[PDB]
Ligand binder design. Structure first.
Ligand code: SF4
Ligand code: SF4
Ligand code: SF4
Ligand SMILES: [Mg+2]
Ligand SMILES: [Mg+2]
Ligand SMILES: [Mg+2]
Ligand SMILES: [Mg+2]
Lengths: 629, 290, 629, 300
């Protein structure tokens, strides 16, 4: 009855998936039928073997306390905290693997330093000497200092310069100034143990402290170091949606998050070995396509075509044209192993952190990265031989998109509209001016996942379109960014189409689309980098700026951790999917009201995107009046 | 002091001044007194370019206040601000037309006042060939009489036309600069509302040289932003009224260089305090090459 | 119905709790009614907001896969892994706070180095120079090297000397050699995220890798450094059970884990200022009593009387004589806040890691430890003022116990039976001889919690009595040790009463009780220290020795991590309470069968203690048969 | 091999050997023939102390094999091992009684054989005063005759009694040591079973000097472990049988010092390879202190 999607190519293959007799994420959601109201409210705890316990989400009725004595608010707050710890650990291991690769960069190695100017600037942030030194001794010293932020037990952590000093002292007084990344994860896991913390306020404050090690450390260093090794992203053209797959070419789909694998696969897609081999098996060439974050990482830097977002990963195999599905970690549906059995697709897992049963494990050798990527890519090209071309169905639907809008490239674009004799170059002042002047009402960050509880891509597009119509420039990462690319919002032509007068005028002068794709979900740090620079340039805190974050169709624990550190930084966050907190009245009051008194921002729960846009515009206008702009 | 609110305030101030001087018109001369500008075939060029209708009597001039009020939508959106800036320009023509009905010769030299149609044709052909690289609508008050002449004689030496309006006229004659059409220095009026007489230059240039019919407002604004290369230089303290008028020059497509601190908008509203290099920023902001 | 306990004092006060009209942990267990069969089997996953999902524990029937595609085995293995990660993080922060106190030790400070010979021996293990150096410069260098083991990202970790190299090489080949403590916690949390690990074997192997950072690092350093600062435990007499509370004295009950607080309170209980105040308010003196681990920590070192174990903590307040309940972290029932409202007892929380709502928070100032302990103890003495002596009911039931049997003291006791001219002194040779000869059939470690699903203390006593009857020496920690103390097993007289011929003969010669209390659950590292020395002295690995571990009434996630690293070390582990794994057939095969092929040991799930004892004796005889002893 | 199995092995071997020589008794002498030891008031001292019944004829000696079979419970528990060691001692008396029934004079010098009751009492009064600090039941074979005599003359010089049984008797006469009751050196027999005649010394010491009635086995073993200070020194390779006999000495409370590698048990079964200090380990393991002689000092 309810529509499964709004993308046509997504719907066409959903009909083929029904014909082929295979299961999809939509089909398994309907099989769950009425999901339990105790876990959807957060009033269930399994933190020991005295349980499992469940208390009533209605205060005053039913069972009031768990066996140990934990109230509904205590149970909810502890379940929330562990979601943040899980989300933090996902981005932690993400950035940890990136920093380790930087330590292993050598002149005669597969991994090299490509953006030297970024390294020299990042080294200054870590108090690393650069004058007269070799560029790889600098890279190793920065990696050592960066890795220390994950597990140092003495001293203070290193935080990026764009973090306003007003916000730092605000965390100190609140008592949530972050420590080591892994240290905070264990601290949350410790206090969530049975018989430990039993106070909603102190528990949530621990979650906020833990999330700060993600946005301003984990994701930041993960983004900081990826640009150094693979190149700082710049504006680059690409194509999106499932129509990028070529019937007469080798379709290798890179899925996952950790970019090191996908980066080597891209370089291995130019080896005369695999280019000629792709022709010897009867194909035109190697057609690389990415999905989710690892697809964003290569699209931002090399313009690799984007096959699709989260809930589309199953329908890519349904096409029957995917020869090699190469995945690493995070958000790789284990159903792909059973699904790929109904096709010739070779579902390949590579990282030891994410083994999948009944899949093809080809361990990515990080000591010989280029050789290992060639070996994996060879196994995908050789599988084109087993393709049956009568059953292949690639929907003829693909839309152009422009991405690559890193903080450096956005600043570079802003230099076009600066008068040579007046203002300073290489700053975020042009963006601060149009915000202060009022041409741009505000700036919104639309990120998030897909969720079967929401018509996929519908809430993402309705939110972005609503915001840009109200002269609110939108920046996007993750699957929300890929939803905009498929729809066709990442185009310069979308300014006159969907944006209001003010935003469309900014797009013409700067020569940019109304929606700025800023990379993967670890690249959300760029938005913190961006908003922070504007707050510092205006001598204010980030809780004073008319900024907002939206997660219309979030799902992962990473989304929980992402939203938390955005609020603690001082940016209002809207949630399109209700988090499991409805059973704790005090927890709801903390997240949607009391948070304002702590960090100058709060969470918003609104399932209707049209209602959220109204709330975002009204909240921004309120902060504008308070600031006098 | 929100920029949109500042423009809306001066726009409402411009309307209130137009209602005041048009009430003087109906009381001293009645609703049927001839309203026209000397040697113009387009009646009121700004109101003509917007509505395609000519204004003949005072009763129509009074009924043209309704045009100003319609453009003063008070919502903080850009299209509302450019419309509000146009409203100030229309109201400046109402005030300036009333000046010509209350007095047979309201502007006396050194003030030139309104610019006749034959001057448009004469001054128009070098603008197309680029003999005069642009026009400079410098208005306001300079902090020193020497810096006013230094800038105007710099613009004059570049070969382009400069238009003085406000106290800078007094600062220019003190600066030993010589005015005149052949001198390419034209003082319009001491009142702020006299800036419409350089605005009518570009609009009439769109009607004459562009062959555009009256009532094609969006097309007139395109011709002004692309063909005629105008820029306005505001000096000294800026009242709410002149700030509202600046948005009208933005609607035409002309950047606004100033020395006063103001919420800047790229390529459209900039603040340059260094008077020695002010000429250089203005030529760049309008893409003017000598 | 089933009896709630086997302790008489526990039953007497449970009736007073019914008379006074207050709820206990037993009352809240019955209110939970039928706990869910989905969470008790482990076939429920809440690792994102697409769920909550539930699959069928019966393979082949019902719903088989979750929304993301995770099978029942994947969900179980991931829920199990997070239990291990939580238990590791609990002991991690425990030892982390201890190592930090060692770094802050000074000559004229509240925290001093008491066992310099232990420190000098530990310094050699960390490659720290000691010759001719100041004793506090040594202590600071050891603390830094110890703290590095929690979050170092490069190099290898420092492992204790008693770890056999055969076991190290076994872990390396299996791929579970530990990294940093916090690093492994985040690694498990990463792979348990949705779309990550989906293989039962690799998931459990990650849990094994994480658990090793607890027993051989976290718990080990916490115990090693506690002995350095507070003194290595030696044979000391004490009294146990709830009869230790004195009606005419100030009854301050120390509950929790972190020993620094309880240690300072003991020293503050001798201040002449605070002694006079205890008399001025109408009391005889300060009567210190401990509970759970922090009660063992002070009892092992200073002979402080032990009030009771886990499920007795509520009944201690029911007496109406507890004036001050000082708690820090871990295993403090949040119901104590609501329970203490029905009495004059001042329920005081001290650590910021475990805030409890409606309690009295008096932050333990680690910068002024003795002063802060005095201030907290004064508020407990001042609360004796509010005592109602008509409502006080203290059962006259307490049994003597002997504890303080550290590895050093056990070796010292073994020197009594060494011939001066024959063997070497200060070795574990006497214990290895009686084991090889066959006088002692084996050695068993009975640890664990209490659980409402088992008649409390019944499974502990029936297991210990059964083992010592079969000539199997028993060592005990945690609440299982305190259950033996209450019953009266920690006495030298228990040899003739309950032990077999072989064990009773060994007890007479060595002059020790048949059950050796070895301290808290972080002191379980002492048992690994002990078993390792026996394995090294006989040139074999630990999977060859006739050793076994029992957790008759476990409950906490800490127990899961404890049981895991005991199995990974190579010691068979029996569980008296079923862990939530019954829904995953492959996970059960891994934990109860395939583990033997991996680490030479496996888990056993047996709820009947008499059946478990039989399994232990038969398993030991097999390993003796395999070894030729 | 597992130590418990090694004790069970020699105990079953001792039973099989006892069944063999008692079968010779019923064929050459019939089921009714006098069975006794010279000048003993306790019949069979080991069997008497355990059951309180005396053995007179061969039919009763044959019926006393059931005592050995009852003591050989083959479960790996300590109390079963001490009982199995006692079974070997009872079987050693059965074989040794059969030696005295098949031959009127089965033991010829230098072998003394059985020790009479008047010798026990004569040797008993100095034991209480501590005149002889202990007894040393050294059996087996030394690797060198000099190291054997070096040890036996050391024990004799300490004033305590030593009892030889096995090949060490031949090594002692080669080593020029002198035997005799007054010399506190008694050679028993060349067969392993002849060690039982020193076991009967301590048992009879419990019956005579301890006043304990026959059949109070637990009390006899208490007297034996506390009062009489005995220790056994086993030298050379150890068969399963002699190992089984060692468990009997443990039941009496006597440590077993040896030079052969063996699963040690503290204070009960130890391995000392250094023959020069072997005497000192034996004196310590049994708590033997030498009585010094100090000249009297008067202060009047
Ligand atoms: S933490 Fe408490 S409420 Fe939760 S399952 Fe455990 S005993 Fe029950
Ligand atoms: S264990 Fe809890 S979350 Fe799971 S199905 Fe049962 S009530 Fe729901
Ligand atoms: S990880 Fe899988 S089973 Fe768990 S909530 Fe997510 S979709 Fe459901
Ligand atoms: Mg950045
Ligand atoms: Mg000229
Ligand atoms: Mg060294
Ligand atoms: Mg006792």
């Amino acid at each position: 009855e309810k529509a499964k999607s709004i993308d046509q190519a997504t719907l066409q293959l959903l009909d083929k998936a029904k014909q082929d007799g295979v299961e999809t994420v939509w089909d398994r959601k309907a099989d769950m039928k009425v999901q339990c109201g105790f876990g959807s409210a957060g009033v269930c705890c399994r933190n020991c073997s005295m349980g499992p316990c469940r208390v009533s989400p209605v205060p005053g009725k039913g069972v009031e306390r768990g066996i140990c004595g934990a109230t509904a608010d205590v149970i909810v707050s502890r379940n929330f905290a562990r979601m943040v710890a899980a989300g933090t650990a996902a981005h932690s291991d993400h950035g940890r693997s990136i920093a380790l690769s930087l330590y292993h960069t050598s002149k005669d190695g597969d991994i090299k330093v490509k953006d030297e100017n970024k390294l020299k600037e990042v080294a200054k942030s870590f108090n690393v000497e650069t004058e007269g030194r070799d560029i790889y001794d600098i890279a190793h010293d920065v990696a050592k200092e960066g890795l220390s932020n994950y597990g140092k037990q003495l001293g203070e952590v290193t935080l990026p310069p764009s973090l306003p000093e007003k916000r730092k002292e605000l965390w100190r007084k609140l008592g949530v100034y972050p420590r080591a990344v892994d240290r905070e994860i264990a601290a949350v896991m410790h206090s969530t143990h049975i018989g430990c913390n039993a106070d909603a306020e102190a528990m949530i404050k621990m979650s906020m402290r833990c999330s700060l090690t993600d946005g301003w450390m984990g994701s930041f260093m993960g983004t900081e170091f990826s640009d150094i090794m693979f190149g700082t992203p710049h504006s680059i053209d690409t194509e999106a949606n499932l129509g990028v797959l070529e019937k007469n070419s080798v379709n290798v789909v890179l899925h996952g998050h950790e970019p090191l694998l996908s980066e080597m696969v891209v370089e291995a897609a130019s080896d005369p070995e695999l280019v000629e081999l792709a022709k010897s098996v009867g194909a035109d060439g190697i057609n690389l396509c990415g999905m989710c974050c690892t697809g964003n990482e290569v699209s931002m830097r090399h313009g690799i075509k984007i096959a699709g977002n989260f809930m589309q990963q199953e329908l890519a195999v349904v096409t029957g044209a995917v020869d090699g599905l190469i995945v690493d970690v995070q958000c790789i549906m284990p159903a792909l192993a059973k699904l790929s059995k109904s096709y010739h697709t070779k579902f390949i897992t590579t990282s030891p952190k994410a083994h999948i049963t009944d899949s093809i494990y080809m361990e990515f050798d990080e000591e010989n990265p280029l050789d290992s990527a060639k070996k994996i890519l060879k196994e995908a090209i050789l599988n084109f031989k087993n393709r049956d071309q009568s059953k292949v169905m690639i929907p003829e639907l693909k839309c152009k998109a422009i991405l690559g809008y890193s903080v450096e490239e956005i600043i570079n674009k802003l230099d076009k509209v600066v008068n040579t004799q007046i203002g300073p170059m290489q700053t975020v002042k042009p963006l601060a001016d149009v915000l202060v002047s009022g041409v741009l009402r505000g700036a919104a960050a639309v990120v998030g996942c897909n969720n079967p509880k929401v018509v996929q891509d519908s809430a993402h597009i309705e939110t972005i379109k609503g915001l840009i119509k109200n002269d609110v420039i939108v920046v996007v990462t993750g699957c929300a960014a890929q939803a905009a690319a498929k729809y066709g919002l990442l185009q310069k032509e979308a300014a006159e189409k969907y944006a209001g007068p003010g935003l469309a005028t900014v797009c013409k002068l700067v020569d940019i689309p109304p929606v700025l794709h800023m990379g993967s979900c670890v690249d959300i740090s760029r938005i913190l980098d961006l908003v922070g620079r504007v707050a510092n340039l205006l001598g204010v805190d980030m809780s004073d700026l008319p900024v907002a974050g939206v997660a219309p169709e979030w799902m992962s624990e990473k989304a929980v951790a992402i939203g938390t550190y955005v609020v603690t930084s001082g940016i209002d966050t809207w949630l399109g999917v209700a988090p499991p907190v409805t059973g704790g009245p005090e927890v709801v009051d903390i997240l949607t009201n009391k948070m304002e008194d702590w960090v100058g921002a709060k969470f918003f729960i609104e399932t209707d995107p049209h209602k959220a846009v109204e709330q975002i515009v009204n909240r921004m206008n309120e902060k504008r009046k308070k600031l006098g702009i | 002091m929100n920029l949109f609110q500042t423009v809306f305030t001066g726009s409402k101030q411009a309307l209130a001044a137009a209602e005041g001087i048009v009430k003087q018109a109906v009381d001293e001369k009645g609703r049927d007194y001839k309203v026209a500008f000397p040697d113009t075939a387009y009646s009121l060029p700004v109101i003509f370019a917007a509505t395609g209708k000519k204004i003949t009597n005072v009763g129509e001039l009074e009924g043209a206040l309704d045009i100003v009020r319609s453009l003063i939508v008070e919502e903080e959106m850009l299209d509302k601000l450019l419309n509000s800036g146009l409203a100030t320009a229309v109201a400046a023509e109402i005030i300036e037309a009333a000046k010509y009905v209350l007095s047979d010769a309201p502007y006396a030299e050194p003030c030139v006042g309104f610019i006749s149609d034959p001057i448009i044709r004469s001054l128009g052909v070098p603008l197309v060939t680029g003999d005069i690289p642009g026009v400079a609508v410098i208005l306001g008050e300079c902090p020193d009489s020497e810096t006013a002449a230094k800038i105007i004689k710099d613009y004059q030496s570049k070969g382009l036309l400069t238009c003085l309006v406000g106290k800078v006229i007094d600062q220019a004659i003190e600066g030993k600069v010589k005015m005149g059409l052949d001198l390419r220095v034209i003082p319009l009026g001491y009142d702020v509302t006299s800036v419409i007489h350089v605005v009518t230059i570009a609009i009439r240039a769109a009607l004459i040289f562009g062959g555009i019919k009256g009532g094609q407002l969006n097309d007139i604004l395109k011709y002004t932003a692309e063909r005629v290369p105008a820029f306005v230089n505001a000096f000294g303290p800026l009242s709410e009224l002149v700030v509202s008028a600046g948005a009208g020059a933005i609607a035409l497509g002309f950047p606004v260089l100033t020395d006063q601190v103001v919420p800047e908008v790229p390529t459209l509203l900039l603040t340059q305090k260094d008077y020695d290099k002010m000429v250089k920023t203005s030529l760049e902001a309008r893409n003017i090459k000598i």
